[PDB]
Amino acid sequence: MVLHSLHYLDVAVSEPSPGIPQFVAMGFVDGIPFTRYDSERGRMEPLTEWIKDSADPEYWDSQTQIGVGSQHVYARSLETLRERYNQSGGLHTVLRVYGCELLSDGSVRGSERFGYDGRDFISFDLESGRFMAADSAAEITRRRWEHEGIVAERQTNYLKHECPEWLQKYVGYGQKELERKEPPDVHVSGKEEHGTLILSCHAYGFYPKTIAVNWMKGDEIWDQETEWGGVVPNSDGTFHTWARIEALPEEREQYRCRVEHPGMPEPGIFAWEP
């Protein structure tokens, strides 16, 4: 099972629009943003206090170099993919997600995936060790990358060695924020619309994102008639979720909500209290 993770998201577009620069690269440690490169600022910058305190100026300047270089690579890649797919001008997007995960067994899983205009293009994995092309256009890149044998060498070396070593470094840098446990604040809301009562169990501001929210009717689990929301982020770095059921108004008091979270000493039970 995944103990920790470090992954990066690259978004490059052929024509910038408001809120979408030419190129943005974002780093996440266990899902939390901690570094950002942006083509308008042209700088790699910290997004948390723990990474700013622990990194030396060489860390930020070397990655500014890597971000500046990637910015030119994606401009050429976008140009290259436009003809391979026989596409006209306008908004085109190249996406890359790469990183590694430290499993509980001590092993590392790593991958680097490219996408173009919402579909797979090319990917690399530590297990397979080979590039997977999604179509004939990506086969051109796969052939060139496999000949030189050098992309696969650099990719295996980053994903299997560099990435986890930086991840272990990042885990120690922000241990206090990464491993904090903030319990959710739970509230059950009820509204009767058109002869149907809608009960919603809301969970506010919890971290980390693992949580269980389940409705009970008497002694029976009521997951069958339960609609779950996503585990969505708040602006402060905590998460939100809900679990919703419909019920007869006259049976409102037979239902209760059970919530479990690593930040709670005990699982809490809640009900609608109008």
């Binding site: 998201l9 978004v11 809120g19 979408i20 943005v24 974002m26 943003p33 950002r36 996406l95 997600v97 996408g115 919402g118 579909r119 797979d120 982020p233 602006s235």
Partner: peptide, 16 residues
């Protein structure tokens, strides 16, 4: 305030 733009496994974007 516009949050930062990310994407999921199916290359579909999201934004807070």
């Amino acid at each position: 305030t516009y949050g930062d733009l990310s994407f999921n496994d199916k290359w579909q974007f999201q934004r807070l």
